[PDB]
Amino acid sequence: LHKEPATLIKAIDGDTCKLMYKGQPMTFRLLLVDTPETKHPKKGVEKYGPEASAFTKKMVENAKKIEVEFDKGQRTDKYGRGLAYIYADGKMVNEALVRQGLAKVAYVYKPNNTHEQHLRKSEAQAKKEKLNIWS
Ligand SMILES: Cc1cn([C@H]2C[C@H](OP(=O)(O)O)[C@@H](COP(=O)(O)O)O2)c(=O)[nH]c1=O
Ligand SMILES: [Ca+2]
């Protein structure tokens, strides 16, 4: 995979944000994970949703550098959101969230699953430690 620079425009929630990519604003959705919902009425504000948003927001807003890394399959979903692993100063937001128990490994669609095992080992550690979602 290859990392590419991006510029934070606006953090929306734990797993969705707007970034300037290739001189074009677009919303991105984190690959392989799912932070709780805070916008959709069908799900309501799920437990830990706000916590996940705050964690992500702090992480991306305080970064000197943001990079996006597409996987080997499709680069956008049906809603036109970019699908990537996002790094804030070299730290993967997707993993950071899972490690804290603020996200679950979800939507594993191949061939977009290069980092699946890494994220799963982190989720296991969070459950093991009974963190947030796993408390
Ligand atoms: C992470 C991801 C989400 N999605 C879709 C699945 C869900 O569609 P439906 O909305 O039709 O259920 C939605 C979940 O994202 P949200 O957590 O933003 O809702 O986005 C993909 O298509 N591919 C992906 O890799
Ligand atoms: Ca979500």
mmCIF file of all heavy atoms in Angstrom, residues 13-16 29 33-38 43 46 81 104 107, ligand 2:
data_model
loop_
_atom_site.group_PDB
_atom_site.id
_atom_site.type_symbol
_atom_site.label_atom_id
_atom_site.label_comp_id
_atom_site.label_asym_id
_atom_site.label_seq_id
_atom_site.Cartn_x
_atom_site.Cartn_y
_atom_site.Cartn_z
ATOM 1 N N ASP A 13 -17.266 12.524 12.837
ATOM 2 C CA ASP A 13 -17.553 11.664 13.970
ATOM 3 C C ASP A 13 -16.364 10.731 14.129
ATOM 4 O O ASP A 13 -15.327 10.983 13.526
ATOM 5 C CB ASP A 13 -18.915 10.939 13.845
ATOM 6 C CG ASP A 13 -18.920 9.835 12.813
ATOM 7 O OD1 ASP A 13 -18.124 9.880 11.860
ATOM 8 O OD2 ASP A 13 -19.748 8.919 12.943
ATOM 9 N N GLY A 14 -16.504 9.669 14.914
ATOM 10 C CA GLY A 14 -15.391 8.768 15.143
ATOM 11 C C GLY A 14 -14.747 8.166 13.913
ATOM 12 O O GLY A 14 -13.536 8.039 13.879
ATOM 13 N N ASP A 15 -15.535 7.841 12.889
ATOM 14 C CA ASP A 15 -14.996 7.198 11.693
ATOM 15 C C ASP A 15 -15.175 7.902 10.339
ATOM 16 O O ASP A 15 -14.743 7.350 9.307
ATOM 17 C CB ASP A 15 -15.513 5.740 11.597
ATOM 18 C CG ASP A 15 -17.030 5.648 11.428
ATOM 19 O OD1 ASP A 15 -17.644 6.617 10.941
ATOM 20 O OD2 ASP A 15 -17.611 4.594 11.770
ATOM 21 N N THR A 16 -15.776 9.099 10.339
ATOM 22 C CA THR A 16 -16.010 9.851 9.107
ATOM 23 C C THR A 16 -15.522 11.291 9.237
ATOM 24 O O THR A 16 -15.769 11.944 10.249
ATOM 25 C CB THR A 16 -17.491 9.830 8.728
ATOM 26 O OG1 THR A 16 -17.976 8.486 8.806
ATOM 27 C CG2 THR A 16 -17.685 10.312 7.310
ATOM 28 N N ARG A 29 -14.136 7.564 4.984
ATOM 29 C CA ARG A 29 -14.703 6.631 5.935
ATOM 30 C C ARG A 29 -13.567 5.657 6.229
ATOM 31 O O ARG A 29 -12.924 5.141 5.298
ATOM 32 C CB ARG A 29 -15.886 5.899 5.296
ATOM 33 C CG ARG A 29 -16.513 4.776 6.129
ATOM 34 C CD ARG A 29 -16.973 5.287 7.485
ATOM 35 N NE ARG A 29 -17.758 4.302 8.220
ATOM 36 C CZ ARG A 29 -17.252 3.265 8.886
ATOM 37 N NH1 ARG A 29 -15.945 3.053 8.922
ATOM 38 N NH2 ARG A 29 -18.064 2.435 9.527
ATOM 39 N N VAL A 33 -13.449 -0.640 10.263
ATOM 40 C CA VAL A 33 -13.908 -0.395 11.630
ATOM 41 C C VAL A 33 -15.250 0.293 11.680
ATOM 42 O O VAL A 33 -15.766 0.760 10.665
ATOM 43 C CB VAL A 33 -12.911 0.480 12.436
ATOM 44 C CG1 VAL A 33 -11.516 -0.133 12.404
ATOM 45 C CG2 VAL A 33 -12.892 1.922 11.901
ATOM 46 N N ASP A 34 -15.831 0.323 12.871
ATOM 47 C CA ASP A 34 -17.091 1.008 13.066
ATOM 48 C C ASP A 34 -17.233 1.636 14.452
ATOM 49 O O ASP A 34 -17.276 0.941 15.465
ATOM 50 C CB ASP A 34 -18.286 0.100 12.776
ATOM 51 C CG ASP A 34 -19.606 0.870 12.747
ATOM 52 O OD1 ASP A 34 -19.631 2.040 12.299
ATOM 53 O OD2 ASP A 34 -20.625 0.309 13.177
ATOM 54 N N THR A 35 -17.199 2.966 14.490
ATOM 55 C CA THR A 35 -17.402 3.676 15.737
ATOM 56 C C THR A 35 -18.920 3.838 15.844
ATOM 57 O O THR A 35 -19.639 3.804 14.823
ATOM 58 C CB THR A 35 -16.742 5.071 15.744
ATOM 59 O OG1 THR A 35 -17.159 5.815 14.595
ATOM 60 C CG2 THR A 35 -15.244 4.950 15.747
ATOM 61 N N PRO A 36 -19.436 3.969 17.073
ATOM 62 C CA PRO A 36 -20.878 4.129 17.244
ATOM 63 C C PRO A 36 -21.455 5.384 16.582
ATOM 64 O O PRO A 36 -20.771 6.402 16.368
ATOM 65 C CB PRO A 36 -21.043 4.129 18.764
ATOM 66 C CG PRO A 36 -19.915 3.226 19.214
ATOM 67 C CD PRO A 36 -18.777 3.744 18.369
ATOM 68 N N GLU A 37 -22.724 5.252 16.225
ATOM 69 C CA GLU A 37 -23.503 6.271 15.554
ATOM 70 C C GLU A 37 -23.888 7.422 16.475
ATOM 71 O O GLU A 37 -24.113 7.228 17.673
ATOM 72 C CB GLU A 37 -24.772 5.615 15.002
ATOM 73 C CG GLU A 37 -25.589 6.487 14.083
ATOM 74 C CD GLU A 37 -24.818 6.880 12.851
ATOM 75 O OE1 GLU A 37 -24.277 5.980 12.165
ATOM 76 O OE2 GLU A 37 -24.741 8.094 12.583
ATOM 77 N N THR A 38 -23.914 8.626 15.914
ATOM 78 C CA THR A 38 -24.318 9.820 16.652
ATOM 79 C C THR A 38 -25.228 10.708 15.789
ATOM 80 O O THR A 38 -25.785 11.690 16.284
ATOM 81 C CB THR A 38 -23.100 10.672 17.138
ATOM 82 O OG1 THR A 38 -22.359 11.170 16.013
ATOM 83 C CG2 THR A 38 -22.192 9.844 18.002
ATOM 84 N N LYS A 43 -30.469 4.701 14.403
ATOM 85 C CA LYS A 43 -29.607 4.084 15.402
ATOM 86 C C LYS A 43 -29.557 4.923 16.662
ATOM 87 O O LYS A 43 -29.302 4.407 17.753
ATOM 88 C CB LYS A 43 -28.193 3.885 14.864
ATOM 89 C CG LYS A 43 -28.043 2.703 13.941
ATOM 90 C CD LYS A 43 -26.584 2.497 13.581
ATOM 91 C CE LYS A 43 -26.388 1.292 12.681
ATOM 92 N NZ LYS A 43 -24.952 1.025 12.416
ATOM 93 N N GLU A 46 -25.625 6.064 19.835
ATOM 94 C CA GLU A 46 -25.209 4.828 20.468
ATOM 95 C C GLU A 46 -24.147 5.062 21.547
ATOM 96 O O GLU A 46 -23.383 6.037 21.496
ATOM 97 C CB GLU A 46 -24.691 3.862 19.416
ATOM 98 C CG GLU A 46 -25.714 3.516 18.365
ATOM 99 C CD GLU A 46 -25.180 2.521 17.372
ATOM 100 O OE1 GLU A 46 -24.052 2.715 16.874
ATOM 101 O OE2 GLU A 46 -25.882 1.529 17.091
ATOM 102 N N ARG A 81 -17.817 7.971 -0.452
ATOM 103 C CA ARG A 81 -16.809 8.260 0.574
ATOM 104 C C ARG A 81 -15.519 7.494 0.278
ATOM 105 O O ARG A 81 -15.565 6.344 -0.166
ATOM 106 C CB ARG A 81 -17.303 7.847 1.960
ATOM 107 C CG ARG A 81 -18.543 8.564 2.411
ATOM 108 C CD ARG A 81 -18.956 8.183 3.824
ATOM 109 N NE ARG A 81 -19.338 6.777 3.940
ATOM 110 C CZ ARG A 81 -19.891 6.232 5.022
ATOM 111 N NH1 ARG A 81 -20.138 6.976 6.091
ATOM 112 N NH2 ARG A 81 -20.163 4.933 5.046
ATOM 113 N N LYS A 104 -15.268 -1.267 16.719
ATOM 114 C CA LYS A 104 -15.223 -2.707 16.534
ATOM 115 C C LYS A 104 -14.773 -2.930 15.098
ATOM 116 O O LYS A 104 -14.976 -2.057 14.233
ATOM 117 C CB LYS A 104 -16.610 -3.308 16.739
ATOM 118 C CG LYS A 104 -17.149 -3.097 18.130
ATOM 119 C CD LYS A 104 -18.550 -2.469 18.130
ATOM 120 C CE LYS A 104 -18.561 -0.995 17.638
ATOM 121 N NZ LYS A 104 -19.901 -0.308 17.759
ATOM 122 N N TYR A 107 -17.261 -4.407 8.685
ATOM 123 C CA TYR A 107 -17.273 -4.199 7.237
ATOM 124 C C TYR A 107 -16.029 -4.696 6.536
ATOM 125 O O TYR A 107 -15.412 -3.975 5.736
ATOM 126 C CB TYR A 107 -17.501 -2.712 6.938
ATOM 127 C CG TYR A 107 -18.756 -2.175 7.584
ATOM 128 C CD1 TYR A 107 -18.688 -1.226 8.604
ATOM 129 C CD2 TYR A 107 -20.011 -2.611 7.175
ATOM 130 C CE1 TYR A 107 -19.836 -0.722 9.196
ATOM 131 C CE2 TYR A 107 -21.157 -2.117 7.756
ATOM 132 C CZ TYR A 107 -21.064 -1.172 8.764
ATOM 133 O OH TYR A 107 -22.201 -0.647 9.313
HETATM 134 CA CA CA B 2 -19.975 4.384 12.160
#
